[PDB]
Design a protein around this nucleic acid. Structure first.
Ligand code: MG
Lengths: 52, 57, 143, 145, 127, 73, 55
RNA sequence: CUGCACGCGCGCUACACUGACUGGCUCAGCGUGUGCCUACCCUACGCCGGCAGGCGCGGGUAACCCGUUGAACCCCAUUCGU
C-alpha cells in the first residue's frame, strides 16, 4: 500500500537466479570462438583466468 | 578495482535497465517509444530502441 | 573386547573421567573458580565444587568427536538459553575465558595440541587413555 | 547424615540486624539480609569452607561468626571488586558491600544528594514518577492515584 | 578553624584543580571517562574560555555574571565549580549555580525541558 | 500442608524406622502427606533406607523415585 | 552560506543520508541488495528490475 | 513528537513441582554477508578479562569462509519442596 490504510496485505516478490559450471582443458585462444557462437542477452558468462 | 556479489550484480543491471527505460520514456514519448532491449558484453554494448517513428529521432 | 569411547553411555563417562583427572592431580585449575557463574545467561555458580574437572572431562570428550575446534566453538557448544526477564529468550554464546583456560589446562596436561590450521586436536596420549578408561567404565557396567 | 536431629537447633538466628530463618539452608537462609543476595551468598560461603547441604539451624556459633566476618568485609578474603554494591563510591572511593540499615542509609543518601543539588533524577524521585526513562502515558498507574 | 566535611572520591576540591585530564578519567565514571578519552571539541573549549574569563572578571568575593550556552552535553569538570552558566532548555536559559556536588553530571540535568504536569479534568475522551 | 518441619524428631523417626517399609507404595510425595516432614528428607532419609536394605528401588527417575516394600517370604 | 557551518551536521550513518534513488524520499526505503529504492517506487519498477511476484 | 488523576486496542513475561535451578548429553531449516554516491559487511582462530568486551592474525563478493550453521524446547542426573 502507498499509505497506512488497508487490511495488512503483503506481496512477495522473488527472483530465482541460476548458476552452472563447466571445466575445460582447452587452449586459451580457441576459448573465444566458443564464446562467439551465441548472442543470448539473458545470460552472463565468465571465463576463468588462465593461470589456474 | 574489485567487483561485487552475484546477488547485487543482477539487481544492478536490472536497475540500470529500469532507469533508462524511464528516461527514454520521458524523451521519446513523442515518437511512439514502445520500450528498449539491451546487450551488455565486456565490449561495445548495444541498446536497441523499439520506436515506431524512427525518422523523428 | 575392542572397545572405543563411542559404544559407552557418555553421560556417566564424563563422571568417570572427571574423577580420573581429579585423582591424577596435575590439572592446573584456575584460582577464580568459586566466583565464576559460567557463561552469563545463567544466574548461579555450579552446584558442584569441582566443576572444573567435569568441564575438563567434557571438553576432552567433545574434542574427540570434533577434531579442530577453538575457544569460540567451545563457547557455542556450552552456551544456552538466556531468559531476559520480561523480554523473550534467546541463545547466548558461552564464556570465553573459562573455555580458553580449560583448553590451556589440558594442553599442559599433554592431551591436546594445536593443528596446522586453526583449532585444536587431541594428541595420541589424549585418545589412548580416554579410550583406556572408556573400556574400564564399560567394564564397570559389568563390574 | 543428620539421622535424627541434634540437641540444639536455632529456631531463629540473629546475624547483623535481621532475624533469619532456621529451616532454610544457609545458601538461601542468609538471603534474608538486605544486601546479601542469592548470588553473593554462595561466594561468601565458599570462602568460609562450609558444607552447602546444611540447613541454617545446624551451624555452631563459630561457623556463623566466620560467615558474619566474611560478608562484612569481603575484600581481604579475596572476593573481587566488581562483585560488590558500592564499587567506587561517590564520597570515599572505597569498594564495599553494604548489608544492613547501612544499605538504606546509603540508598536515601544518594537520593537526597540529587535532591540537594536538584538534578533531573532527583526531582523524579521527589515526585512519584518513573526514573530510568520509561513512558508514563500507559503504565505505572497504581503508583499514583 | 576553616574546616567543613568534604571529599568526593577520597579527593578534595583543593587537589582536584591541580589535577591532569588523565587521572580525571580514572576518577570519573565509565561514561564520562569515555567522553574524556574521546576529545573535547571546539565549542566545548570555547565555553570554558568564557568560564575562565568570567572568574577573572568577577568582582572580589562576589559570584560571577552568567555565561549563556546551549550546549547541555558538557561534563561538569572541576574547573567551573562556583561558576554561573545559563543552560538552554529549548525555550529559555535557566540560571544554574554550579556547586561542588554536581561535579560529575551533564548540564542538562539542571534545566528541565518540560514544565511538569499538574492536574486537569477529563473532557470528551476516555469513553 | 503448611508448617512442615525438617530434621526428624524422635516421634517420627521411630515411626519411620518401624512402619514405612511395611506398605507397598513408598514414595517421597506419600511421606509428605502422611508424615509431616516436607520432603528433601523424603528424598534424603529414603535414599539411606535403600542404603540399609529395608526397601527396594524400582525406578530411580529424576522426576519420580519409586520404592516398594521388600519381599518377606 | 558561511561554508564551514552550512551543511555541517554530519549526514553519515542514519536516515539523513539514505535516500530513495528515484525521487529523494527518506521513508521506508529498501536498502537490501543495493536497491536503495523506497517502499512505493519498488512496486512500480519491480517488473523492470526482474522481480516476478509469484508467477 | 517519550510529557501523565485516567479509558481503550495489538503484544511480551508470568502466576510454578506436567516446574525452577545447576551440570551433563544431544538434533535444524529458510536465509544473509566488504557498499557508484556510502563512511559502516559476515566472522574463524590465537592471546588478554569473571562478564560486556579489547588487540593480533586470517578467510569470504560466497554449495568454496563463518558452517558439518554443535538453535532452544526436549532428553538424562542434581538441588528445591506448596
Ligand atoms: Mg508445585
Amino acid at each position: 500500500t502507498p499509505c497506512g490504510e488497508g487490511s495488512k496485505t503483503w506481496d512477495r516478490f522473488q527472483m530465482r537466479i541460476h548458476k552452472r559450471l563447466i571445466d575445460l582443458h582447452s587452449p586459451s585462444e580457441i576459448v573465444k570462438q566458443i564464446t562467439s557462437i551465441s548472442i543470448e542477452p539473458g545470460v552472463e558468462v565468465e571465463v576463468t583466468i588462465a593461470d589456474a | 578495482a574489485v567487483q561485487i556479489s552475484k546477488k547485487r550484480k543482477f539487481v544492478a543491471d536490472g536497475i540500470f535497465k529500469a532507469e533508462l527505460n524511464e528516461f527514454l520514456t520521458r524523451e521519446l514519448a513523442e515518437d511512439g517509444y514502445s520500450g528498449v532491449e539491451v546487450r551488455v558484453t565486456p565490449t561495445r554494448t548495444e541498446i536497441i530502441i523499439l520506436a515506431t517513428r524512427t525518422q523523428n529521432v | 573386547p575392542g572397545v572405543t569411547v563411542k559404544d559407552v553411555n557418555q553421560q556417566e563417562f564424563v563422571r568417570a573421567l572427571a574423577a580420573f583427572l581429579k585423582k591424577s592431580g596435575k590439572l592446573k585449575v584456575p584460582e577464580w573458580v568459586d566466583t565464576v557463574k559460567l557463561a552469563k545467561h545463567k544466574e548461579l555458580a555450579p552446584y558442584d565444587e569441582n566443576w572444573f574437572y567435569t568441564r575438563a572431562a567434557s571438553t576432552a570428550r567433545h574434542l574427540y568427536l570434533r577434531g579442530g575446534a577453538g575457544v569460540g566453538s567451545m563457547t557455542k557448544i556450552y552456551g544456552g538459553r538466556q531468559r531476559n526477564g520480561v523480554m523473550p529468550s534467546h541463545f547466548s554464546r558461552g564464556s570465553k575465558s573459562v573455555a580458553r583456560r580449560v583448553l590451556q589446562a589440558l594442553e599442559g596436561l599433554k592431551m591436546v595440541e594445536k593443528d596446522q590450521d586453526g583449532g585444536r586436536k587431541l594428541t595420541p596420549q589424549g585418545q589412548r587413555d580416554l579410550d583406556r578408561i572408556a573400556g574400564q567404565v564399560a567394564a564397570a557396567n559389568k563390574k | 547424615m543428620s539421622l535424627v536431629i541434634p540437641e540444639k537447633f536455632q529456631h531463629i538466628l540473629r546475624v547483623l540486624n535481621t532475624n533469619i530463618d532456621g529451616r532454610r539452608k544457609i545458601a538461601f537462609a542468609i538471603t534474608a539480609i538486605k544486601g546479601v543476595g542469592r548470588r553473593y551468598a554462595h561466594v561468601v560461603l565458599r570462602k568460609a569452607d562450609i558444607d552447602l547441604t546444611k540447613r541454617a539451624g545446624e551451624l555452631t556459633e563459630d561457623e556463623v561468626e566466620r560467615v558474619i566476618t566474611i560478608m562484612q568485609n569481603p575484600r581481604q578474603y579475596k572476593i573481587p571488586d566488581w562483585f560488590l554494591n558500592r564499587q567506587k563510591d561517590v564520597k570515599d572511593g572505597k569498594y564495599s558491600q553494604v548489608l544492613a540499615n547501612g544499605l538504606d542509609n546509603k540508598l536515601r543518601e544518594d537520593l537526597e544528594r540529587l535532591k540537594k543539588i536538584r538534578a533531573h533524577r532527583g526531582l523524579r524521585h521527589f515526585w512519584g514518577l518513573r526514573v530510568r526513562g520509561q513512558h508514563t502515558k500507559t503504565t505505572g498507574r497504581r503508583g499514583r492515584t | 578553624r576553616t574546616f567543613r566535611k568534604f571529599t568526593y572520591r577520597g579527593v578534595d576540591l583543593d587537589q582536584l584543580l591541580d589535577m591532569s585530564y588523565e587521572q580525571l578519567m580514572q576518577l570519573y565514571s565509565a561514561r564520562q571517562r569515555r567522553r574524556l578519552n574521546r576529545g573535547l571539541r571546539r565549542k566545548q573549549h570555547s565555553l570554558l574560555k568564557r568560564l575562565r574569563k568570567a572568574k577573572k572578571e568577577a568582582p572580589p568575593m562576589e559570584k560571577p555574571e552568567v555565561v549563556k550556552t546551549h550546549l547541555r552535553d558538557m561534563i561538569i569538570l572541576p574547573e567551573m565549580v562556583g561558576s554561573m552558566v545559563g543552560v538552554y532548555n529549548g525555550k529559555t536559559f535557566n540560571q544554574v549555580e554550579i556547586k561542588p556536588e554536581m561535579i560529575g553530571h551533564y548540564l542538562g540535568e539542571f534545566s528541565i525541558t518540560y514544565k511538569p504536569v499538574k492536574h486537569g479534568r477529563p473532557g470528551i475522551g476516555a469513553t | 500442608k503448611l508448617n512442615n518441619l525438617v530434621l526428624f524428631d524422635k516421634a517420627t523417626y521411630d515411626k519411620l524406622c518401624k512402619e514405612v517399609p511395611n506398605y507397598k507404595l513408598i514414595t517421597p510425595a506419600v511421606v509428605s502427606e502422611r508424615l509431616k516432614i516436607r520432603g528433601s528428607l523424603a528424598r534424603a532419609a529414603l535414599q539411606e533406607l535403600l542404603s540399609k536394605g529395608l526397601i527396594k528401588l524400582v525406578s530411580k527417575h529424576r522426576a519420580q523415585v519409586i520404592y516398594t516394600r521388600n519381599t518377606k517370604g | 552560506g558561511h561554508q564551514q557551518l552550512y551543511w555541517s551536521h554530519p549526514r553519515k550513518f542514519g536516515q539523513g543520508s539514505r535516500s530513495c534513488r528515484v525521487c529523494s524520499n527518506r521513508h521506508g526505503l529498501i536498502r537490501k541488495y543495493g536497491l536503495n529504492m523506497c517502499r512505493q517506487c519498488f512496486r512500480q519498477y519491480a517488473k523492470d528490475i526482474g522481480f516476478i511476484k509469484l508467477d
